[PDB]
Symmetry: D2
Subunit: 469 residues, 4 copies
């Protein structure tokens, strides 16, 4: 963490959180992230081809030149068939891919030929626009949730894929004319997180050459990367560590810093950390109230109103299941906020009501329960309120939503002085806590706020703010 | 309408509606659209400057060369001061600007130096991203509601504005390096509507030169323009008409077609036509029901559910004021639709609830009423339902919303067999109709649908579809 | 007015560019219209009526040509330039003078081939470049290149005429012309001739020089244009417009000289030709006997004179005469061997063989080459002029009349005798110029057997003629 | 194997490019390392240890140079090339042979100045181009240009060495080299010499030729490389790799010849020099008396021989001898006047003046110029060789020994007499080649007074030597 360009895990997270706080975060990904999913390294992929022309893949230092010689002796199609085959595998994305989908990353650039990165987004609520030819980059578009640039092409059109040496030589001339400037722009404006790459890749020199724009002293821009530290098992340990050090110091010239893991699992540990800490910006609200315990009806209505309002004032997104007695006034508070500050409500509120009569005339409970889980896994905090009706002392839905939040690792914030299932969750859950931050938030929220609502809503707001740091 | 490149008003509207139906619509605007707002033509703006160097503006055919000579004799600053002054005028946008803001135009390109085009959007709900230097075009951005390219610069930085001849010569070299490719892309991908321009502009040749990409036979792309037909008052009528004809036939080489008005007011007539016809894609729903007339509670709930559901199935956006008894189930129906087809609700529903307790502790009725009018002017249809409580035979809010819809020219669709204020509006309004399409929709909706809900919701859906053609 | 210059200032700076081979020429319609070609206004009159527009009312002839090409297809303008621009007209006196000057880089917007043939009407080997394929790579062999920016009449389908032919310039065709022109503009000093702010394509032409606006531009270029005339309506107004336009050009490093009649162009070029010709001298004579000198002394006087003429950077044209020319070769060969140079760089010979190569008369061809060779010289030095029994050698006297025909400064030497001395007795009485007379006096001074004094006299007389 | 060619095929196609002046040369480290420069592996050994890396373990020396430049600032490599590459080493025999060949365009990646000085070690005027400012515009004067793609040792701070020096190539610096190289590659036929697939910068170098992959490329280029050797480990494997690599080059229109020792390069260049030299001939002699001919007949025989030698496209080198050389000039002048050509294009003279220009001995300088001039000729023709009383003229016999020194094909004429006939009597007995003997027989045939038969004999003997 003093080798030039080296940074600590906390340094990495701090700067990444700046990029997230300013919507300047993008992702740059390579083969190192898809190989753990089940895809073949290029060495083995070229082993049999290498033997098919009379050369040993173990003897060749530059696999790019090897693919070129192969394309010459066995016609180009024979590499298309190699990529069409060994990269169209029916493989599931990794957990890293899902965590990347959950993050606020709108721009993705990748050199691998697989389609895992798109599927992680399609599985989440995001609908990517995957771009592979100049014709898609022309002009501008504002619509899609995210853009996935397939810089080195895609497995759906391998005859155009960037594989051989002359495919890199002809990059931008016969093909991909506009990729260069769009990539250089994203590199100078966004803060990028680099993942699936290694200095020992075969295509590395060609990949790094595109970043020549970052050598301009006027760059000022910083990007961050992750790679595996050299390991004792690796023979020539000290020598390869020196090589890797000089390789990172060379990398830092382009404004890229590096964090070093010891096994690739550690990558996920960071991504998850960033997902969880980001999820706490999105809160889940549960409850149902025919009666508002010690509060009068209008007082229990305006307490909810002023709580959702204050949560919007501090920049928090709300997910609610539009419960009886609760949802109308969560909406009312957020509408009061957005009307006060000429803001848009859909920027702050996502609802999950429970329909009565499916128009199609078919049960939708399965679909509804899945939608609910999809919304909840995007949340990081769960606040529970009331949970009572004339015949429900402990409303069922509230308890079901607590168990569901307990599954997704949400920080649970039951409110004791509301009664009902909310207080049942307080009485049960308070015995199952161990962390200082969570305990501090729980205590800060359930205070004896005199019944008075201003202090009552604040207590909860400060409990929320505590969990964000 | 047989001169090459000439088209009829109905032709123009048809093709424009294709571009709207495919989100491929953009706008290209010039000085001819801001002069009616109160700004000075360049001829008069250069009259005193022309005299300030010993030349008569009446004698000079090329005002661009005139601005160049002026910048030479009187230093460049003296033109900056000319633009800083005579273009920073505290002028209101025109009705054309507001109509353009109301349309689904996400990309705007303009050569004028004023800021009317941004203000028309800021007045509407849209928040434009005005781009003036390459640094803003680098990379990509997905966030903003619309992009306003100031191709020839802006009055906020006149020292960089494109004015003189050498400012066109140095276009793209010392300044505006990326504007050329972004503009060419938008021209080859979007369908553009050209407005504030004339063949007699002084900067015309330079402006049209950028479109050389459209001369490639592989262009296939079509764009549309509007200009004033020559008028008897114009001396040399027949000769100038021949010149204008050949000018349009030359224009059509770049894939641009032309419609000819006789006075500029006619422009607005078309824009309005496109706004109104587009507004009918967005429906306003009004009502309030403690009791559901001849329907049981659950039956009146599921009727609303199945109506909003069917309206979402046919691709219509809903604006509702979350009324008593009505809003919960408008939301429920749209949520049923979006959950059935894994769609997002905010794409279909915009709400305007009426809060009870302002958290700030100040009356918000003024703000709420303005928000309501802003939402309603975006709608083209108004459907009224029920409008009754225990003490309200004719709910007040429903009548107030009818008078408000009557102000904004909405097609009013009251439902008779719901009773209440809805039926009061039917009984009063049906005497104030004159158009075939509106009358046909009103009759198609209020049919004797047996009380049965499937036919009842259809009746209304077909009444809506009728007004869209 | 900024950007205006004096005629003598113009000649001085242009001659500086000549001194460093940094001189190129940029030519336009103003040089081809006087030869017999039709102005564009008239050339487009009948077409203009052919679409319903009047050339008298249309100020923008480029857009007019576009409209015509639109209604009547491209072919009909391919046929138009093929017609009234394919006239096989002889180049003007300006063209021949430019051929005589050391201009190796020619750029032109004209569609005719006048300047190319004017160069062909000489010892020059022009290489006309009109397509990118010719600009590719590098080549040094050809004597000069004529760059045709706006195409040529042999391929009018590619000519740059209409507006969109300018719009598509450099993208579909003529891709390399842009950067190569900018290079020549940033390295050479260019002389602009056939152009006026009132041309129809001016706005389009001037855009190509935008590189000269870079403040890092040290290069200066020069142009010649027609001054406004009282008869011209709005006289003072057009004088003001032209004044401000001249100040506008200077942004590109272009200066302007103003003529009152187009003849002045020829007067300047002619002047520059004359003053350039004096760097290369013609020598005449023949010595069967070495008068006033012993044989060896008359041989080495010639040898040591040609050597010093080469040392002072003057090119020699000689007819390899017996006894006079014979040793000029040896003297210049001694120079080039002394200074590791090549002989043809300093000596051009004009011999007369004894036997035709394979049976053909050569007298006419020889004299034609001779007259053209003398038109390349600016000074004519005469020496000896005697044969077996001819006190006044035959060729030398006619060569005096021939140098007098081509306006060469005649510098005969008296103390050599023969036809040279008869020409001396004639020329000293048939002159009126102070500089010429002063140089002649500096040349015919003498110490006698001391030959260095003679060689000095002659060399210093030459330098006097070059001031 | 595709892209391999025969030695005679190589010579034939290269001589086609020579016949059209379309020949250029592309040179690399393989020609400068044998002269005395250090391979890069060793040059980077001490630096490699200076950062903790072994050149024996690092396969990518470009990335290695980058790492070193990163830890130790750029200056320390500026100093490195300044040191072990600034050795003032003499050019090799290959360099001198390339100087003797008609190669006007030279492109090289080397940082030394061997090829430039080898050209300076001749009559050549090299113009070394290393910065964009020199490529701007156009110029035809200089005798040849040496393009230094990767910089020069005089400005190592700009040299292309590290990886990022290749990345920043054409963007910050050397902006115009890319398009000008592509032009020369698409128009000229280039001969590649000092390169191998095992070079460290090869991947980077080959990318510049991507334009040659355009299917519209008709141009063919040629290279020479070292064949694999049995001693080399993995012999058959390296033969397979090199085979596939040779087939890879042909995509760029590049063909390959394979040597077994680097000497073969010199053998090919030498061969091409010899066969090119025979297009230019040296003539010796002097005729105080015109043996076997009347005076006028011996004059016009020489005249009409030089004329026909010019007609058949052969350049003449003559020492302007009295009676022999004197009329060569007249004959070639008649030719150039007949065919509107310039004399120095066909005739190069080597005179010997009577009096030093201003008092300096010239014998040594004259003979040095002479030996270099004869090394430019491939055939030596001897004629007459007599003086006032010298049956065997002095200069001519030594010139026979001199042509024998430089390996010229000696073609003396018997029926002229003098030293020429003594050389004829010596040479006919001192030869062994069939072609040389056949041409000599074709030359010394005779009809006699009929001079056309004599001129034929000689010209046809020349053409026999050029087959």
């Amino acid at each position: 963490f003093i080798i030039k360009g080296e940074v600590s895990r906390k340094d990495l997270i701090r700067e990444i959180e700046k990029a997230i706080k300013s919507d300047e975060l993008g992702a740059f990904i390579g083969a190192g992230l898809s190989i753990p999913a089940g895809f073949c390294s290029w060495k083995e992929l070229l082993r049999e081809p290498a033997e098919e022309i009379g050369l040993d893949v173990e003897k060749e230092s530059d696999l790019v030149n090897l693919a070129q010689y192969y394309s010459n002796s066995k016609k180009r199609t024979s590499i298309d068939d190699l990529i069409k085959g060994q990269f169209s595998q029916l493989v599931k994305p990794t957990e890293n891919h899902k965590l990347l989908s959950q993050l606020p990353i709108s721009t993705f650039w990748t050199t691998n030929y697989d389609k895992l990165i798109e599927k992680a987004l399609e599985n989440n609520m995001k609908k990517p626009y995957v771009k592979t030819k100049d014709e898609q980059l022309r002009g501008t578009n504002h619509n899609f949730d995210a853009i996935v640039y397939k810089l080195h092409g895609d497995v759906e059109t391998p005859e155009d894929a960037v594989i051989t040496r002359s495919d890199y030589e002809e990059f931008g001339y016969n093909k991909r004319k506009l990729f260069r400037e769009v990539l250089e722009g994203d590199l100078l404006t966004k803060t990028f997180l680099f993942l699936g790459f290694s200095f020992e890749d075969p295509n590395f020199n060609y990949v790094i050459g595109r970043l020549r724009v970052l050598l301009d002293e006027k760059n000022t821009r910083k990007h961050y990367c992750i790679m595996k530290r050299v390991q004792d098992a690796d023979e020539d340990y000290e020598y390869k560590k020196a090589r890797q050090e000089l390789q990172i110091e060379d990398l830092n010239r382009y404004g890229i810093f590096t964090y070093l893991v010891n096994k690739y699992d550690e990558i996920t540990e960071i991504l998850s950390t960033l997902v969880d800490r980001f999820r706490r910006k999105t809160i889940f609200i549960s409850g149902s109230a025919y009666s508002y315990s010690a509060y009068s009806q209008k007082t229990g209505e305006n307490f909810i109103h002023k709580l959702s309002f204050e949560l919007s004032k501090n920049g928090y997104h709300i997910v609610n299941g539009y419960g009886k007695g609760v949802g109308e006034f969560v909406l009312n508070g957020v509408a009061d906020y957005c009307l006060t500050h000429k803001s848009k409500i859909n920027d702050f509120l996502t609802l999950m009501p429970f329909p009565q009569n499916s128009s199609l005339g078919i049960d939708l409970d399965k679909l509804y329960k899945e939608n609910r889980e999809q919304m909840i896994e995007s949340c990081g905090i769960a606040i529970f309120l009331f949970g009572n009706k004339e015949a429900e002392d402990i409303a069922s839905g509230v308890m079901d939503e607590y168990e569901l939040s307990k599954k997704h690792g949400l920080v649970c914030l039951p409110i004791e002085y509301t009664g009902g299932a909310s207080k049942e969750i307080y009485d049960q859950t308070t015995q199952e806590i161990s962390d200082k931050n969570t305990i501090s938030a729980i205590e800060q929220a359930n205070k004896q706020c005199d019944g008075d609502i201003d202090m009552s809503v604040k207590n909860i707001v400060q409990a929320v703010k505590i969990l964000n740091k």
